[PDB]
Symmetry: D2
Subunit: 396 residues, 4 copies
């Protein structure tokens, strides 16, 4: 009976491999997943798990899977939590859960372990995912439930001669992948404190490139990003290219006070240049290709989807049913959106679509005008009638 845990090569979890081994008497399988977080080579991470006592240590390249099956759905629901940020650090959790469960089935795992705390959202996203996909697996939360701390890890590593880097942690706690980057530091827990330049990495300062804005065309086919400036791309490639081009213009710097599911507010810093460009473009394309009342209701389902995924309910039946709604709406969301990236800002300035609902002749007053204005007087009379009857009663 194995313990399966997600592994990124850090101090606490590296030491947790042998500690879990000694605490449970079970062998540990480390699962490292490439989601485009950069940093150390995946093989170096893989080997570290082995050197720290893992019986098996595997690397999964899930970058395309993440882009295709997690980022694209977020784009299709224009997902912006608090109407501010695109679920950075929420999207990858169900993917990680799915791979941990798969590895448990393959490597005789009966227990999965995670390192989330009791005041974050990630504990919810992991544990609700495990309860939904594999309720037979026991779940261990060493940090939340067994007081597993850095200090305890270091003492255990010393006593057991675990080969691990215990040099001072920098003031920043970083969580990043190809979709975006989250930064935590003590200084920014005070709401009147502004971030400094050292907080950023994915993006340049928005004062760069004064005379060199970047005009970009992003194309979609049925709600999926498929081209940039006429060049075909995969969804992963689209995210990566727009991370670069957006980042070079300071785009996607986010500074949010958000509502955590566990009942408290917290101040967070995010960088998500490519995500914000893609969601902004996708929204502009829906304004060209989706009918009025469908769009008004879809703003409601967009919001609900974002809430469900934030709240650790990716696998919930309401989320799954909303995806069937979304899929139908995306049928004709096909076209290109032109934007200028500059000064930290995304400015739209062009649209074209073979599925456009914009009708030049209905809108124009030019010679081609086809709008029958004789209908309007009667429309306004009936549109206003029920509230006018109510007003009469009020004023009587």
């Amino acid at each position: 009976e194995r313990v399966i845990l997600a592994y990124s090569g850090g101090l606490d979890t590296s030491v947790a491999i042998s500690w879990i081994g000694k605490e449970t008497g079970r062998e540990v399988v480390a699962v490292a997943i490439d989601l485009g977080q950069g940093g150390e080579d995946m093989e170096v991470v893989r080997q570290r798990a082995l050197d720290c006592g893992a019986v098996e240590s595997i690397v999964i390249d899930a970058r395309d899977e993440f882009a295709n099956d997690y980022c694209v759905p977020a784009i299709q629901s224009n997902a912006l939590y608090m109407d501010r940020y695109p679920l950075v650090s929420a999207l990858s959790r169900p993917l990680i859960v799915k791979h941990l469960v798969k590895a448990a089935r393959e490597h005789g795992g009966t227990i999965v372990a995670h390192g989330c705390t009791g005041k974050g959202n990630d504990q919810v996203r992991f544990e609700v995912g495990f309860a939904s996909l594999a309720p037979d697996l026991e779940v261990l939360a060493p940090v939340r439930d067994y007081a597993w701390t850095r200090e305890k890890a270091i003492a255990f590593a010393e006593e057991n001669n675990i080969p691990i880097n215990v040099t001072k942690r920098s003031p920043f706690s970083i969580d990043q992948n190809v979709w975006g980057r989250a930064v935590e530091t003590g200084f920014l827990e005070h709401l009147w404190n502004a971030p400094t330049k050292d907080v950023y990495s994915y993006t340049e300062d928005p004062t760069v490139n004064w005379s060199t804005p970047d005009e970009v065309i992003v194309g979609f086919e049925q709600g999926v990003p498929v081209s940039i400036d006429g060049r075909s791309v995969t969804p992963l490639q689209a995210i990566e290219e727009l991370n670069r081009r957006g980042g070079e213009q300071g785009v996607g710097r986010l500074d949010v006070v958000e509502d955590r599911l566990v009942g408290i507010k917290s101040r967070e810093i995010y960088e998500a240049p490519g995500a914000m460009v893609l969601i902004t473009a996708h929204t502009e394309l829906e304004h060209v290709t989706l009918e009025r009342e469908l769009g008004r209701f879809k703003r409601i389902t967009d919001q609900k989807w974002g809430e469900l995924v934030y709240d650790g309910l990716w696998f919930s039946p309401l989320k799954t049913a909303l995806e069937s709604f979304v899929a139908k709406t995306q049928e004709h969301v096909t076209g290109e959106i032109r934007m200028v990236l500059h000064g930290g800002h995304i400015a739209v300035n062009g649209r074209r679509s073979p599925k456009s609902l914009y009708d030049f002749n209905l809108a124009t007053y030019d010679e081609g005008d086809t709008f029958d204005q004789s209908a309007a007087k009667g429309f306004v009379q009936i549109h206003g009638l029920s509230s006018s009857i109510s007003a009469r009663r009020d004023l009587q």
Copy 2:
């Protein structure tokens, strides 16, 4: 029996005064309302109506009224139609309706006239307004219903050249229509803009600004007390100097078509952005989630010409309660056409440093979390079990 109409000194409406006089055989009262649109001196405009045959010509300074009773409600509901622009050209319409009805009561008016077309939103906002506030008044729509045009005006009759731009502006914002931009692949050029400078002009000098609210009403800038009108004006200037509030939208008109519109709303966008940030500090989670729904609905109602509808009025009662504690200051940087938030403080804050921190003062009881997650996830986990059975 008289005809009342809104008047801004334009050619078409100036002649319409005479033409309505001949056609209906009735006297005409012109009503010019100052909403911060600039342009000609109001007294010059007032006199022109008289010279064109109006029996009465009045001027109303409604700038503070507009700011206080129309713009502030838009701020309190974070109003952004299509999630893009702050109801530029929608907010002033119910105010103008109210003043035209008042003028009708004061000057023996039995008819009100407007110059809206049959494919715009303004016809709805005016006519639903009239039907609600004063159903006894006949409504005359010479442009939509009687083929009144600049050409008919000139023929009937000081003629200025036709502008390639159709501009509608007041202190809250500016809307620009031009034929070139009816093509969606055409980008705006610099001559469309007026309220705002290009982001590149004052790039070297970013503007950090603090905006304070009291019960959801803007009341200070950088510590200086301001009226709501002064707030809008100052942030128009400071935002405009940084290119903030330039909007380019494809929107759904109520009459069933999409159209491409250009807006400038620097002050409005700073105010609505700041107000939203302050609600994230001062409103509880689930109240905030539901208020995003009512924010959206309010914006749709006002867009749709339903300012005076009973649902809009009832939402205002909801909104007023939510605003009780929306008090505090938001610090932002205006630069590059962008609004960046970087600071909040509030005497009504729901942010609790000790509950959030992992530092020594941490007060969060993590022992509650395992049980919470178990029950929070239970119903969907039961459904999953059934699915996978």
Copy 3:
């Protein structure tokens, strides 16, 4: 170039056949559709159109199509307009539109005509349907737009010797099909006037069957009614059998003040015994088979669907997208609901399902109890935390 019109054998429309012929110079094709309205034999109706000058007169049996593709979707969205009645007289309109358009393509029709007035909902349901399915067809509304009245019809019939029954119209205006019956009479336009026995037809007085209530089991498979008391049925058969059994118990008598789309309130009388039994049962089954938060949101989409269909927007993209949402939700809506029909009332008293989300062992305090109560204290603490923080601020 033909004119196509829907035809049920009545006075106004019978005379309209030759009048339209004389007014437009075009030949008229009459289309009669069996939706289970009973009354005259369809062949008698068909022949009448011919005797009144139609160049072609066709009968379409659409009873199963109506049940399968219109009534079943209403059941799946629990459709109750004003939370009161199941869209009686709204559901069949898009079906009728579809068949009128089909007949136009088959019989060289360039014009479709309808007899709706300018203050009803039916004008909207017909004309928005025609604009969506066949905008190339001209639409004629003789009653609304050309002052076509009974009195004008009778005078035209006399002058042109049209063979048609012009005997006094009874005080009631009835619109019925297998899904339900709508009754209009002048007396009931006064809100303090109660209906009399003569108003009813589909249902017995609810005082009948004192000692003989009817307990019925209705089964569904993926949201579709498929059995009654263990006997397999088609959806049409289910509606018909429950019309009878419900009607014999006075079930489905409805007396509503409703909001018409054209801005006014009106008082309406409906009989819909089978529809109310099916919608009530379907709702009870969703309470057994759909998860909590999915159910809460589905009450929202149920309401929206009912509004769209009432408002003549059956063919709208929001309605079509909601159907994709609904289809996913119905995947596991499978089981049986036992109800007692009696005294005008539907009383549920039993449920069973092979897809049940009810868990006896989690609910019971009996020996089999599996609910872990140790989780509850912490759940309540966090569930209440955000509103408790807000209360503290309020009270400070």
Copy 4:
């Protein structure tokens, strides 16, 4: 320092008074609240707490307060959880919390105790209530957290036999739990019922009743003025005699499970049905459509133990505005377990006979309709054209 607890004279809680005394070494104050539950005389109950070691034992008559400030809000939001039952056993909880907190302030209480289990909703309604109104008070849950049972009670220690029924009732309604009905294919038998008679009993004598409201508050029955409490009581009797308000529900508990519940709520169902009918007469279309959404949300909030939440409070401000004109009378027939509506009248009616009728007085201008339909259908028709292209 004292422990405060709600008390109804039951065996388990009577002994708990002593047991809490020994365990915590603290004095206990029992609080008995009259909500129309019937049963033992309140003074007898009061005395029993004293005989069991309580230092103070008080009785509160909260019947009118309950009706006025808890039941009437439920009526105004047409509250029906799962669209089935009117929050029986949910409404009284915040009232009881308020009185327990008050008693704590009056009698030096630093701890409040409740007897809720870990799988019910009541634990949430009590504990969220305490956390909101009085976070300084420690909450003790002997049944959930300290394994307190009838068996532990009897062991620790007048013992009555155990009923096969767990009953929770007050003037608003009655809830019944019994093991037999935990099986969903089992139907209730006649012994489950008490507030209501079988529909067959008084079948021969249907009861036509008129219920009047003033600003959404019930104020008359058959022309006779009544208080809200009297309204609930009279309609309990008249509805109950006709078998009205018998409910059999599978509901979603907040703690993640479904459960089967039996309710009797004759008066509540008559009142909520009538109130809904009156809103259909007095509220405009779109306001009514949106209010169905807020009705639903309010019901969920109160079910979920969030009576005191800021979203619930803000919805009450919305609701109060909507109720301004909800005034008039609704005529219904009670028979066969069913409520049939057959009459409405209102001095605030939005029904307009002349606009609706085709008779000689018809005032509806049908010339508006063709244009209305053309534009109402335009956006979806444009989308259809695109679909079919």
